[PDB]
């Protein structure tokens, strides 16, 4: 027992729970800060950028462009659009108490995010070691998902591709491989056959990996490029 893969599976799940809570906090933080500076959300689309920007700005919008740390967070073009939009914002300064609670949740969120990254890294590193080739094809994360359900690299390899495409499924017959990045970077029309294709190659990659071969991912890479080429063909 104590197989490392189960550790990584569960670390990878945390990551999803932290993504969820971060999404919720962003929504909260947007809503609360709406009164100070209602136009900003439209200007800073990236949640984390938005939260970092809010933490930086605070109660005083004026002079935002002049700030040297905000220059670190947003593009100069954007800094200038927000600065100009600040001068004509229709929102009132916040109470000491609402400002303070806003800052508290902003801090909470950035701390959450740092831990999120720390875990993402850990999952990447260990997955690249546990299934170098598999990882290369679908990413550490998806790979960890299909390993968790399967119950390890050996139990996964003893599976036929068609069942590996069905893992984590419950429009139709879409499981983890379908919801993978590589598959999702295609137009919906091509996703089903793309999922089929990725599954097949992941089946090959898992088997190599069960025997601790091509430990530098050569196979994973060949397979990936072979998969990407067909993607190009269909375009």
């Amino acid at each position: 027992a104590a197989p490392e893969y189960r550790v990584i599976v569960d670390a990878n799940n945390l990551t999803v729970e932290i993504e969820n809570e971060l999404n919720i906090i962003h929504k909260f933080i947007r809503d609360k800060y709406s009164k100070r500076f209602p136009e900003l959300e439209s200007l800073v689309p990236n949640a984390l950028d938005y939260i970092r920007t809010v933490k930086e700005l605070g109660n005083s919008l004026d002079k935002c462009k002049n700030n040297e740390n905000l220059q670190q967070i947003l593009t100069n073009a954007t800094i200038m659009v927000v600065s100009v939009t600040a001068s004509t914002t229709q929102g009132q300064q916040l109470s000491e108490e609402e400002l303070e609670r806003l800052e508290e949740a902003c801090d909470m969120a950035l701390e959450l995010n740092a831990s999120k990254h720390r875990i993402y890294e850990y999952v990447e590193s260990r997955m690249s070691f546990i299934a170098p080739n598999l990882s290369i094809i679908i990413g550490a994360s998806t790979a960890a998902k299909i390993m968790g359900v399967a119950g390890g690299l050996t139990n996964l390899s003893k599976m036929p591709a068609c069942n590996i495409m069905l893992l984590g499924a419950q429009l139709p017959h879409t499981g983890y491989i379908y919801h993978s990045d590589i598959v999702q970077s295609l137009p919906p029309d091509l996703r089903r056959k793309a999922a089929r294709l990725v599954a097949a190659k992941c089946t090959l990659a898992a088997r190599v990996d069960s025997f601790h071969e091509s430990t530098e991912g050569k196979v994973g890479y060949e397979l990936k490029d072979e998969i990407e080429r067909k993607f190009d063909k269909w375009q």
């Binding site: 003893k158 036929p160 068609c162 089946t203 088997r207 190599v208 069960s210 025997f211 071969e213």
Partner: protein, 125 residues
């Protein structure tokens, strides 16, 4: 010529002929599953007479789980040199790296299957 040491046990030219004949006959009698994937299924399901693999398969690891499944289920497995050759015996214009002769009810092929099984069990030492 040399084959990956890992493709064990490899059939010589005589056994190779018999194997491919029997595979071809099984394709006709419909007791033949073709492809590493479908061969895996027949093993998990418990309906495999014996397994035949191409030592041609690259990376060889893509079929190496089969001998493991086999050892557990007590199913004979053998290698031949050529996946193009196996392909042809499976009716397919394409190379076939693994295939399974499945159990069938009152098979005419029974005696021949039994005979092939024994030959393969001999090579396992």
């Amino acid at each position: 010529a040399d084959v990956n040491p890992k493709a064990y046990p490899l059939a010589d030219a005589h056994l190779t002929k018999k194997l491919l004949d029997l595979v071809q006959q099984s394709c006709n009698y419909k007791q033949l599953r073709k492809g590493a994937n479908e061969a895996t299924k027949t093993l998990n399901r418990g309906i495999s007479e014996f397994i035949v693999m191409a030592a041609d398969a690259e990376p060889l690891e893509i079929i190496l789980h089969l001998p493991l499944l086999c050892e557990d289920k007590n199913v004979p497995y053998v290698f031949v040199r050529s996946k193009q050759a196996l392909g042809r015996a499976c009716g397919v214009s394409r190379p076939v790296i693994a295939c399974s002769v499945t159990i069938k009810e009152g098979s005419q092929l029974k005696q021949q299957i039994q005979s092939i099984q024994q030959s393969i069990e001999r090579l396992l030492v």
